[PDB]
């Protein structure tokens, strides 16, 4: 029992200087070796403290005091290691795709999937280390696998031109039906639906057939630029916040 | 069993006066020594209270009452010590780099990584002691390893100049393509996308090739100062909140 401890003491001193050959806090590394020393001797006097050590059932409740504290103390670290395993088998996202969550803020493209953490580059090219325990408790969304991007807008006419809203919501709908960048078999809704406090709004809701974020914005720009002069083909001219003033 | 307690009582009284030789609360250090005294005698009468002490199984559930309370009582302190160990091995940030989190507020540059806590100087040069248990449950972001800083802006033209937005969003895009401080192989988007309630907004979104916070702001200043007179080269002139008034 003592020569086993002697072999592993010099073995972890080899490990200690193998930490010091890397650049890693040599003053601190001896504290780490002291921690490993006292924990392996306490797990051995927990195990083999009945051949030579005394009061068996007393060390049973001593280990029950200690191990329960260790168990619910490092709960989240082992949960990070466990849910990292479930990311290794049931991977809900690949490497090169941006993910998102409506609960937390983890938005960005994945770069590597570690065991404890998961490195995600943001859209500012900053790395963001996410613990894997979120990935078994929040609703991860994967817009990397998005099949169509979506344009969506209210229009907001000037609230006195209510007689003209029918031909506007007809012309915008038929323009979006004949636009080459817009999908046709997806949803396509141009309808007067909101009735706001300053403007008659027109919901415009459709999908482009590309998911590339460059031509999507160009298609959205061209669609809005056609919406504007469809509105100003007739006399509509949008709307501002538009209060009245009732001066004394 | 009693001479062991006598040796360690005088040993921790040596420890007590070794605390008093440091500057540390004399009327408190004896309370600390009394705490260590009563806890080592209760862990010994938990252990060796069967050779001489009586009712073994009764002290088993007595220790089960006590040690469970101690276990889930100091859960977070041991979790701080445990996740400090995982920062010693799997370090998700070095010393000299500012980290951040979108969940909590720990923003600042790291100064040292202790075992229990982690000292972070803020951007007000104030120290901020963070318990390490956050670092295994929140999503730490590391903008110290940021590869490019990012400029990002809406423009907001005056909503009657919709016929001019195409040449403006062309000229700004080609100015950002030929600016020396802007990266070219990163994302570069100048597009009309927002259609706000008071202004036609133009998303401007690109990256500088430096991460130094001094020349980044100078590049952002020069880019915005060129955006302004590109806008005022044509007649656009931005926009204000711009309501109508409908006087009676």
Curated annotation (Swiss-Prot), chains A, B:
Disulfide bonds: none annotated. One of its GO terms (cellular component) is plasma membrane. The keyword Transmembrane applies. Its main location: membrane. Residues 13-39, 83-248 are cytoplasmic. It is found in: Cell inner membrane. It is a multi-pass membrane protein. Keywords: Cell inner membrane, Cell membrane, Ion channel, Ion transport, Membrane, Transmembrane, Transmembrane helix, Transport. GO terms for biological process: cellular response to osmotic stress. Mechanosensitive channel that protects cells against hypoosmotic stress when highly overexpressed. Homoheptamer. Belongs to the MscS (TC 1.A.23) family. This is Low conductance mechanosensitive channel YnaI. It comes from Escherichia coli (strain K12).
């Amino acid at each position: 029992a003592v020569i086993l401890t002697i072999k592993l003491f010099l073995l972890i001193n080899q490990f200690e200087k193998q930490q010091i050959k890397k650049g890693r806090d040599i003053t601190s590394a001896r504290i780490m070796s002291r921690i490993i020393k006292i924990t392996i001797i306490v797990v051995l006097v927990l195990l083999y403290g009945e051949h030579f050590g005394m009061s068996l059932s007393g060390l049973l409740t001593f280990g029950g005091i200690g191990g329960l504290a260790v168990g619910m103390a490092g709960k989240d670290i082992l949960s990070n290691f466990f849910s990292g395993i479930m990311l290794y088998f049931d991977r809900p996202f690949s490497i090169g795709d941006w993910i998102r969550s409506p609960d937390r803020n983890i938005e960005g493209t994945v770069a590597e999937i570690g065991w404890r953490i998961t490195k995600i580059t943001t859209f500012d090219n900053r790395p963001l280390y996410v613990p894997n325990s979120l990935f078994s408790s929040i609703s991860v969304e994967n817009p990397g696998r998005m099949t169509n991007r979506r344009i969506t807008t209210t229009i907001g006419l000037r609230y006195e031109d209510a007689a003209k809203v029918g031909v506007i919501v007809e012309a915008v709908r038929e323009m979006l039906k004949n636009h080459p960048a817009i999908d046709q078999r997806q949803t396509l809704l141009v309808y007067f639906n909101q009735f706001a406090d300053s403007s008659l709004n027109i919901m415009v809701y459709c999908f482009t057939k590309t998911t590339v974020w460059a031509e999507w914005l160009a298609a959205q720009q061209d669609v809005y630029l056609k919406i504007i002069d469809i509105v100003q083909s007739h006399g509509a001219d949008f709307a501002f916040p538009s209060q009245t003033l009732y001066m004394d």
